[PDB]
Design a protein around this ligand. Structure first.
Ligand code: NA
Lengths: 211, 205
């Protein structure tokens, strides 16, 4: 199939800025490439098709260009409603294929996360499972690193992370890391530490507790 | 106005067959071809199948060829997608799209979840620690299927609340947390899980 390589996967911009989003086909597709906009929980909306042909109703700040293998989406003077995810699309041959997508987020000043660690509740421990939750509250940019240490033993493969959508008020993100152990494994160790690395912190911060 | 309303999505066991339909209104349905496109969780759109206006030409994506069948009933303005031998990979929002030769017009889609999990209410556990701002929350663990809604103090508390997207656990059940920061009062999270008719209020101390 024809593979579309979209860049970048995320982008930071401000209202009134000009944005450029790139998409390259693994082989010639002529001008049969479009651009889609999508927001969480919403169906995609076609903004541009035919490389440069803007669909009816789409603001004129949207425009497409390029032909052959390289294609570009440009948005002049961003508007608050423009922050969303964009995909390129090609229908020159089958199967129809889509780019990786580009999440366009609101750019903001750096904001360090508030870090909290929650021990597993006694109620949950009666069931045989222990969940240790680490919270990174309202930080920016989105990139962060959370490391779990159990008695100074680096943990791996026993945690899951969840990131929220960019906040509509302060434009920050929040993140949760959950260390999952059984009641047996958990009761065999004392200190549970969550170390958070974020460029808003002068140095990584460690939140921990003694069981 | 052009209207496309997908339906039929739901939880289906692996290997079973399911029939998705798409109700079209606002245009001459028998004059346009139609595509099926799906969106797996966290992934981009994936094209599925196409069908000509008269239903004589049908093309399928390799990942669904031999298992899915696309069809249409122009007398009912309804597009169909028959999914056989459903796999876990087939979990996604299935979209209905019209094409012309508005190049593509999409419906809101319908969700399909392939899983052996049985409907199960969530376990609600408190999140308490053990400095001005403090943090509390609730752990909504081991429920199926999506979704769950979490309020705080019956909706009287919304500022500072973060309800994280659920993650799919190895067990096939979903789990999420809801937290809120407060100035260092009573605090109670309200968990709602429609599929199991479960409604839980849990105070946090
Ligand atoms: Na979660």
């Amino acid at each position: 199939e024809i593979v579309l390589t979209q860049s970048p996967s995320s982008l930071s911009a401000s209202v009134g800025d000009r944005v450029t989003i790139t998409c390259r086909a693994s082989q010639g597709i002529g001008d049969d490439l479009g651009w889609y906009q999508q927001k969480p929980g919403k169906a995609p909306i076609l903004l541009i098709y035919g490389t440069s042909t803007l669909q009816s109703g789409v603001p004129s700040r949207f425009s497409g260009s390029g032909s052959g293998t390289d294609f570009t989406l440009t948005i002049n003077s961003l508007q608050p409603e423009d922050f969303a995810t964009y995909y390129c699309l090609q229908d020159s041959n089958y199967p129809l294929t889509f780019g990786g997508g580009t999440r366009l987020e609101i750019k903001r000043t750096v904001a360090a996360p508030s870090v909290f660690i929650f021990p597993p509740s006694d109620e949950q421990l009666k069931s045989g499972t222990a969940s240790v939750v680490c919270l990174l509250n309202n930080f920016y940019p989105r990139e962060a690193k959370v490391q779990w240490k159990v008695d100074n033993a680096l943990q791996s493969g026993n945690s899951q992370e969840s990131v929220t959508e960019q906040d509509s008020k302060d434009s920050t993100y929040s993140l949760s890391s959950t260390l999952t152990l059984s009641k047996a494994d958990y009761e065999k160790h004392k200190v549970y530490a969550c170390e958070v690395t974020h460029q808003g912190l002068s140095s990584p911060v460690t939140k921990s507790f003694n069981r | 106005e052009v209207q496309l309303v997908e339906s039929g999505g739901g939880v289906v066991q692996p290997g079973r067959s399911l029939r998705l339909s798409c109700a079209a209104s606002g245009f001459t349905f028998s004059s346009y071809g139609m595509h099926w496109v799906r969106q797996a969780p966290g992934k981009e759109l994936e094209w599925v199948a196409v069908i000509s206006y008269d239903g004589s030409i049908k093309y399928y994506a390799d990942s669904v060829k031999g298992r899915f069948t696309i069809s249409r009933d122009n007398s009912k303005n309804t597009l169909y997608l028959q999914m056989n031998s459903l796999r876990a990979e087939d979990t996604a929002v299935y979209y209905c799209a019209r094409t012309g030769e508005p190049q593509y017009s999409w419906g809101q889609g319908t969700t399909v979840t392939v899983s052996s999990a049985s409907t199960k209410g969530p376990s609600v556990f408190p999140l308490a620690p053990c400095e001005s701002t403090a943090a509390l929350g609730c752990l909504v663990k081991d429920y199926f299927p999506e979704p769950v809604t979490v309020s705080w103090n019956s909706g009287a508390l919304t500022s500072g609340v973060h309800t994280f997207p659920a993650v799919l656990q190895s067990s096939g059940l979903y789990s999420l947390s809801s937290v809120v920061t407060v100035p260092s009062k009573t605090y109670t999270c309200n968990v709602d899980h429609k599929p199991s008719n479960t409604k839980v209020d849990k105070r946090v101390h």
